[PDB]
Every structure is written in structure tokens, then in C-alpha cells.
Amino acid sequence: EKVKVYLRIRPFLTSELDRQEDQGCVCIENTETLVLQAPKDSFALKSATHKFTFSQIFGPEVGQVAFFNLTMKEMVKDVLKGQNWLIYTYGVTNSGKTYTIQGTSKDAGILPQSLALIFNSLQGQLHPTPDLKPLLSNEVIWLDSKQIRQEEMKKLSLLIGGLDTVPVSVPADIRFSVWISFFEIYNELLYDLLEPPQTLRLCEDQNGNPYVKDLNWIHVRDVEEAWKLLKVGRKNQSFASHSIFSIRILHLQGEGDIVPKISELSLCDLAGSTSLHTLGRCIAALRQNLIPFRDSKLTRVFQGFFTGRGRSCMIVNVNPCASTYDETLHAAKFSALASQLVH
């Protein structure tokens, strides 16, 4: 029950349905079992049935709002209450990964819907001044006038690109500060995406916890600012991989004498096709019970989610096509809870 795996199967295109791509390769036996079969009429010149277990399987008919409510809504609510959530996303060729993550202007993905829910819930309870920065998952730094002015300019340079969800309940006595970071892991090297268009170093805490040194945490006042930073972040990624987008909420309880608390909602966009192999070993060891999180930079970044300082889950996007069967079988073998070979 540790790392829940959700499978989302993309609907068939009218074009792909005509190219004989529907051969019964991807089948939902039940809400937890995916049945994979080799194509009937092979696209390659030639002449296997596999069963896979997932936490829940959401078929092609499952829309954006329904998918969000059945998976993400509870996790975003958990984060608003004080817990830490990490959502891994998987997909290689035309899987529906980006439609699930960001989506269209109307059919908004899990990331815009989460940001919308956060700001709808925290509405009228936001701490105006970006006074305290959650530089660490457990620590806050105080910013002076010079530092606030400097952080505002970096934010402004990004926003100008250089040169209805029903809310969740939150206690009335708390004030909130929302901060965002966005970085990429390209060939074991870390790159900041919230930098106006150089690598980042992974350092150990004063208590032994790793963190990304000099990574930009941008204070966000509303959903429009958060959305723009994701767009600017993806534009920088497209200018130049594992895409890590983090939302950190600073909770300020009480009047006069304040008690600060930090919660986090992180989304990891895993690259298709070694770091993936270590993550598999790390998730398996986490579900089992030491975890070999140091054997990779990706698992070192998310050390907190393997040491009990947060909860993890995975969303796997699948292409139902017969030409992508071989890619679907690797994705299933990698992400599934259990795997059976039908004899």
C-alpha cells in the first residue's frame, strides 16, 4: 500500500483505429488487472499474454476532472493539511502523459487542477509579504528588504519571458505562503528551469538531508503566476530528461507568536525508455519494509520520500496501439505491483 500505481489508458484516435492499431493488445480485465497481448496481425514480418497488477486502472472513457478526483484530489487535500506528496509520471510515445500532466486550455491536466484547488482553498488566507522562504522541506529563512526586492526582480524577469473546482477545507487561524521550484535532470546533471534564458549542486543539510543548492523558489500569489512559471519552465526545457516541479506551502499558525510548518506537492516527469532502474529498486524496497537511494541523483533528490518524510505514488500513461506494444510491455514491467505470464 506504500507506492500506489495508477494506470491511465489513452483513448483510440479515429486515424489510428483505421491503421489497424486496435488488435486487443491493451485490455482491462478488472479495476486492478491489465492484460497485455502481442498483436494479432504483426506490423513486423513474423510467423505472448501478460497479466499486470496496478492500484487502479482508468480506462479511455475517464475524463480529466474524473481522473483528478479519483487520484490527485485527496493528495492535494493531504498537502493542504500538512503532509508531503510526490507523484511520479510515466509515458514514452503518444501515451497521453502531457494531456494528463498539463492538458489543453479547457481539458486542464492534473498539474493546473492542483494549482487551482490550492489557491481556491487558500483564498483570503494568504500571507502577503514573501517574508519567509521554505528553502528546505523542514526549514525557513527570513528575507530582508534587499532580498525580497531581488527575489521580486527574478520573478518579474520570468513572468515577462525576458527580452470551477470546489475548494478543500483549511483552518481559519492559519496564514499561507505558496512557493514553486522547477528543475530538470539531464544526464545526471541538474538544471534550473525558472532561470531567464549552468548546473546546480546537490548538498547535504545541517541535519544530513540532501537539497538542491541555489535552486530558485519563486513566491506565487495566484494560479495565473504559477501557470505562467510552468509555461516559462517548459519553454526553457524546449530551448535546451526528468522534469521535477515542486509546490511548497508554508503554514503560519496563530496570532502574535507564530508556529511555522512546511508541506510539499512534487511532480516528477520521468523520461521514457539506469536512474529509472534505481528508482524501480528504490520503490520495491520502500514497498517491502535499506533503500539504495544514493545509487542515483534522482533518488537522492527525493531521499525524504524513501526515509518516511513524505508519501509517493506513480501515474503511468499508456498508448493502446499495437505498434507501441513493446513500449507498453516495458512500462508495465517497470511500474506494475505484480506480473504474471499466462501459460
Numbering used by the authors: 62 to 108, 116 to 231, 286 to 319, 326 to 368, 379 to 411, 431 to 446, 455 to 508
Excerpt from the paper describing this PDB structure:
We obtained a 2.7 Å resolution structure of a microtubule-unbound murine KIF20A fragment (residues 55–510) comprising the MD and the first residues of the NL. Overall, the MD structure displays a typical kinesin fold with the MD in the open conformation, which is generally not observed for isolated kinesins. Close to the P-loop, a sulfate ion is found at the position normally occupied by the nucleotide β-phosphate. (c) The open NBS of KIF20A MD alone (X-ray structure) showing disordered switch loops. The difference is due to a bias in the β6-L10-β7 conformation in the X-ray structure that is involved in crystal packing contacts. The common interactions between L6-N and MD core residues are particularly well defined in the crystal structure, showing multiple hydrophobic contacts, especially in the βL6-βL6′ region (bottom). We also found that addition of 5–10 mM Mg2+·ADP did not disrupt the possibility to crystallize KIF20A in the same conformation. No nucleotide density or ordering of the NBS was visible in the electron density maps in this case. No ADP was visible in the nucleotide binding site of the resulting model, which was thus refined against another native crystal dataset obtained in nucleotide-free conditions.
KIF20A is a critical kinesin for cell division and a promising anti-cancer drug target. Among the kinesin classes, Kin-6 motor domains are unique in having long N- and C-terminal extensions as well as a particular long sequence inserted within loop L6. We also provide, for the first time, a detailed description of unique sequence differences and their consequences for the structure and function of this atypical kinesin by solving high resolution structures of the nucleotide-free (NF) state of KIF20A, bound and unbound to a microtubule, using cryo-electron microscopy (cryo-EM) and X-ray diffraction, respectively.
